[PDB]
Design an enzyme around this catalytic site. Structure first.
Site, PDB file in Angstrom:
ATOM      1  N   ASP A 113      -2.230  -5.117   1.365  1.00 54.95           N
ATOM      2  CA  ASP A 113      -1.493  -4.345   1.825  1.00 54.95           C
ATOM      3  C   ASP A 113       0.375  -4.242   2.111  1.00 54.95           C
ATOM      4  OD1 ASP A 113      -3.869  -2.156   2.195  1.00 54.95           O
ATOM      5  OD2 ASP A 113      -4.285  -3.239   3.903  1.00 54.95           O
ATOM      6  N   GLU A 146       0.659  -1.070   0.755  1.00 55.11           N
ATOM      7  CA  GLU A 146      -0.211   0.062  -0.236  1.00 55.11           C
ATOM      8  C   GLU A 146       0.976   1.191   0.022  1.00 55.11           C
ATOM      9  OE1 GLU A 146      -3.053   0.696   0.326  1.00 55.11           O
ATOM     10  OE2 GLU A 146      -3.137   2.555  -0.368  1.00 55.11           O
ATOM     11  N   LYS A 204     -14.769  -8.487   4.438  1.00 59.10           N
ATOM     12  CA  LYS A 204     -12.924  -8.577   4.078  1.00 59.10           C
ATOM     13  C   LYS A 204     -12.545 -10.488   3.317  1.00 59.10           C
TER      14      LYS A 204
END
Ligand SMILES: O=C(NCCOc1ccccc1)c1nc([C@@H]2CCCN2C(=O)CSc2ccccc2Cl)[nH]c(=O)c1O
Ligand SMILES: [Cl-]
Ligand SMILES: [Mn+2]
Ligand SMILES: [Mn+2]
Length: 178
Positions: A93, A65, A119
């Protein structure tokens, strides 16, 4: 048309985070001047991702990320083609060289269990770690990767952000924006 929330974000987060957040939204076609709660959320997630990668040993985490989408996929390609780990369907990420798994870091203003489900339903192999603005956390297989102090200072920072907006009457708008 400049909000209180935009000025607070620029005074609350460090300039490297703010600029990475701005690039990110523009890259995806969003305006930090208008979608100001998202602006705030992006900076928060970004800062949590950076503190998290700082909790390990020196070479433990690759940071996915905060990168240009093309360069983020380039590094995960390289990680996959050198560790033999399956290529995730969506950009995570971080990557953990110690545990050999991609990490999806979540920051939610709702309850622990729902976002993880949301998620996890969308992810379908990568590790999931969720943090709350209240101080709760949940990770896949209850394996939280980092030691307790590293996660603790992440939670501490999230709650400080919470208070700074509440003292500016911006918390209510931010909570119900998610
Ligand atoms: O990397 C991500 N997306 C790549 C593309 O993101 C942009 C970037 C700029 C504009 C639009 C999408 C990513 N995205 C999500 C949420 C759900 C999936 C789409 N999404 C979002 O659009 C919410 S923005 C968000 C909100 C809270 C925390 C963190 C973030 Cl990023 N949550 C994450 O934890 C995460 O890492
Ligand atoms: Cl370690
Ligand atoms: Mn991400
Ligand atoms: Mn994330």
């Amino acid at each position: 048309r400049g909000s209180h929330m935009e000025d607070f974000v620029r005074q609350c987060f460090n300039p490297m985070i703010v600029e990475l957040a701005e690039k990110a939204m523009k890259e995806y076609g969003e305006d930090p001047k208008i979608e100001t709660n998202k602006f705030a959320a992006i900076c928060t997630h970004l800062e949590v991702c950076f503190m998290y990668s700082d909790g390990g040993s020196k070479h433990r985490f690759e940071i996915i990320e905060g990168r240009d989408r093309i360069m983020a996929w380039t590094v995960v390609n390289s990680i996959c083609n050198t560790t033999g780990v399956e290529k995730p369907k969506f950009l995570p990420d971080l990557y953990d060289y110690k545990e050999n798994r991609f990490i999806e870091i979540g920051v939610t203003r709702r309850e622990v269990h729902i976002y993880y489900l949301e998620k996890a339903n969308k992810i379908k192999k990568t590790h999931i770690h969720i943090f709350s603005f209240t101080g709760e956390e949940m990770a896949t297989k209850a394996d939280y990767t980092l030691d307790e102090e590293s996660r603790a200072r992440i939670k501490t920072r999230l709650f400080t952000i919470r208070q700074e907006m509440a003292s500016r009457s911006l918390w209510d708008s931010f909570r119900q924006s998610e």
